[PDB]
Structure formats: C-alpha cells, structure tokens
Symmetry: C4
Subunit: 80 residues, 4 copies
C-alpha cells in the first residue's frame, strides 16, 4: 500500500482480503491480487477488520472512528 501494513487481514466469504494501512486506507483486494476498492479514513488504520454476518466490514482508525463499510466500499456509518 502507501505505508506499513500493521493491520491484520480479514477474509470475506468470496475470498476478498480486507486490510488496513498506515497510508489511512482500508483495502479490499481480490484473491488474484488486484484491488477491488480502497476506502480513505483520516489516519492510519492499525486496527484489524472484522466482517459481520451481512458482509459489512468494521475497522478502527487512528482518526478516532470505528468505520462500517459496505462490501462495495461505500461508507455505511462511522462512530466517533
């Protein structure tokens, strides 16, 4: 990514790999190694993502928020 990957990856049901980066983004990578999407938070994503029953991806950020991202990379909500 653009910075250290301290975050630990999570794997979705279709094999998508989600991981944060110190570059501030949450990455969704296809199992073939090509980017599916990236979502920008306001600070390093050290937190490791979790996947809910409906596929929502949750991850914290050093920007103080817990993010809930939809599987298509669009923000569901953020909690401060």
């Amino acid at each position: 990514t653009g910075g250290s990957v301290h975050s630990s990856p999570a794997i979705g049901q279709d094999g998508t790999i989600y991981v944060g980066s110190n570059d501030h983004y949450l990455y969704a990578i296809n199992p073939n190694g090509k980017l599916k999407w990236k979502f920008e938070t306001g600070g390093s994503v050290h937190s490791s993502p979790a996947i809910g029953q409906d596929g929502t991806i949750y991850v914290g950020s050093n920007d103080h928020y817990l993010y809930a991202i939809n599987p298509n990379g669009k923000l569901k909500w953020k909690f401060e």
Copy 2:
C-alpha cells in the same frame, strides 16, 4: 471514539460490534451505528476483545487488567 481505535473489533451473535479505544473505553455499538454502551477502564484499550460462549466480552487494558464485561456493559470481573 475519544481517541485512536487501535483495538480490532469483535462481532457478537446479534451483530453488536465491540472495540476498544485509546480513550480508555470498551465500546459496544449496535449494527445501526448507535452506541449500545461504553465501559471505562483506567488506560488505553489496545487489546482486541474476544467473546465467550455465554457472550461475556474479554479485553485487556494498558491499566494492567484483563476485563470480563457482561453483554449489558456491567463488569463481571477484572484480573490484574
């Protein structure tokens, strides 16, 4: 939250999202993004919560304790 979310979220059986914050609290957030409760420890919650078979939430804190929280946010025990 009030500080960086380094902690990695855990998801309960009803979809509740639990995560620590450097603001010293463990947060329980409803799947709609509204706060269910927060529990205050005495230091940053870098540790990532785990959920036991009965729903108890366990998480460490920089205050030296491992906390066991009930699903309703009331302390079960803390271990130093």
Copy 3:
C-alpha cells in the same frame, strides 16, 4: 497483570481465557476470573495467542520466540 495487556485474548473450549502481558507472562484465567496458571517468557507478550486443535496455546514474545504451551501451562516447545 503486572503490566499493560496489549495482547488480545483467546478463549479455549472450556472457556479458559488466554492472554499475554507486558509483564512477560502468558496468563490462563478461569471463566470465574481466577488464575489457572501463568507461563513466563523473557520479554513482553504483545502477540495474541492462538489455540490449536489439540488445545496447545501458541504465542509470540518480544524475546524472539514463538512459544507452544500445553493446556496445563507446561512448555511444549519454543521456536527462535
């Protein structure tokens, strides 16, 4: 414990909670909050434990080793 709990807990099949501490120990805590045992490594246990199919607990340490502990707290092996 004796220092910050940065490690993230793991839960065994009988509900035992395993977590590292910056005090250098891996802790096994009974679901009632009483200590089952502690195992001493040579440096902070920031790593979060994993539990194998036979119940062995694996965790890293800042002492450079990956530890394999038996469920009774006796060392199985360490790898440097």
Copy 4:
C-alpha cells in the same frame, strides 16, 4: 526468530503455525516445533496472518505490501 514476535499466530488445517517476526520473515512452523519454511519480506512483519479457503496465507509487512504466500512458502502475489 531473529527478532520480536509481535505478530499473532494463525493455525492451518494441518496444524501448521504461521507467524510474522520483526526479523522481516513470515514463519511456517510444524506442530512439532520444527521449521517448515520462512518467507522474507522487506520489513518487520507486525501484521497477523490470515488463511484463505484454499490455504493461501496473507500477511502485511512494514515494507508496505500485503503478501499472499502459498502453503509451500512460494510467493503467490504481493500488493503495494
């Protein structure tokens, strides 16, 4: 390993234990404590590995990449 093990281990279906090290390698250790292989990245492996449905091991590195390693230790891809 050659440096602190901050990474948290993952366990494969055959019991292999995967963990990163600040020495820059991802380690695959057999359940008997003998090395199965190690894979070198370009910086500390603080990230904790995840295992996909086909056994691929994914882990981040402070070198900015998310790595996808095959179960035999050969690189599948890396994503920057």
